[PDB]
């Protein structure tokens, strides 16, 4: 029941393969919905459920805004290089903004900036204040706090326009966003030196949240479990692994336990 709309704008001073000079991308509930970059010079849809509910006027508006951002990012990279007394080279400037609809029906708004991979400045729409996360951002906090009309336009957008769009987009995406795909689980084992490494892998599940654990005689072995981060497949489903090292003679005591929204009860799996 929670939802999110987020835009990420990223500029680099020294482009490379896969890293255009400027990119702007949108995400709904973590799903990529559109893309602009400095090479294409236009914003296009990246999910057919989004494409089927938008039109040329919509994309031309996103393109005009993204072209404006691209111009601003080129100026800001040079402002930041001078702010920090840096040489020319490889630098990154980033913005993330957007809005959340939470489980209680309440909303949150975001507008935050990162320079060189570090928090720089962030806007609090509830208070109309900027917070400098780095000393070199205090000059910017003072400049941008004098721009009251612009702050009010951001507040109105984050609280109204952004959420109004998110609620529509969640409706456009219902068939994809609300789907459930079960994990396909495999247990494998490797004996090395009177150590047996048991591996449990869950494949192809959706949505992303999952619980995977190793049990000994039904008892969770949390301190002994190694687990990977949840990572995506090419079809937008997910994968996770968990391992445990056990005495080969005790192999029959161990089961992998998987819990997921697609499953009507916990999955229990033996090697």
């Amino acid at each position: 029941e929670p939802h999110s709309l987020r835009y990420f704008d990223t500029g680099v001073s020294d482009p490379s393969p896969g890293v255009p000079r400027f990119v702007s991308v949108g995400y709904v509930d973590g799903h990529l919905i559109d893309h602009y970059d400095s090479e294409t010079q236009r914003t296009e849809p990246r999910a057919d459920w989004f494409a089927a509910n938008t039109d040329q006027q919509y994309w031309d508006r996103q393109t005009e805004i993204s072209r404006g951002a691209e111009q601003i990012f080129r100026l800001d990279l040079e402002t930041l290089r001078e702010r920090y007394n840096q040489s020319r080279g490889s630098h990154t400037w980033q913005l993330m903004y957007g809005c959340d609809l939470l489980e209680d029906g309440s909303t949150r708004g975001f507008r935050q900036y990162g320079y060189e991979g570090r928090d720089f400045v962030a806007f609090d729409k509830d208070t109309l204040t900027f917070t400098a996360a780095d000393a070199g951002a205090q000059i910017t906090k003072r400049k941008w706090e004098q721009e009251g009309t612009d702050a009010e336009r951001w507040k109105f957008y984050l609280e109204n326009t952004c959420i109004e769009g998110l609620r529509k987009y969640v409706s456009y995406g219902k068939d994809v966003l609300e789907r459930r795909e079960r994990p396909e689980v495999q247990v494998s084992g490797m004996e090395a030196d009177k150590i047996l490494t048991l591996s449990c892998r869950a494949h192809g599940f959706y949505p992303r949240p999952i619980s995977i654990s190793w049990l000994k005689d039904g008892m969770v072995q949390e301190q002994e479990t190694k687990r990977g981060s949840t990572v995506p497949n090419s079809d937008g489903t997910y994968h996770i692994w968990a391992t445990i090292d056990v005495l080969p003679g005790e192999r029959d005591k161990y089961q992998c336990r998987v819990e997921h929204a697609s499953l009507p009860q916990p999955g229990l799996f033996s090697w």
Partner: peptide
């Protein structure tokens, strides 16, 4: 839908 950026550093 995006927000227009209207200020520079």
């Amino acid at each position: 839908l995006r927000k227009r950026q209207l200020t520079v550093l």
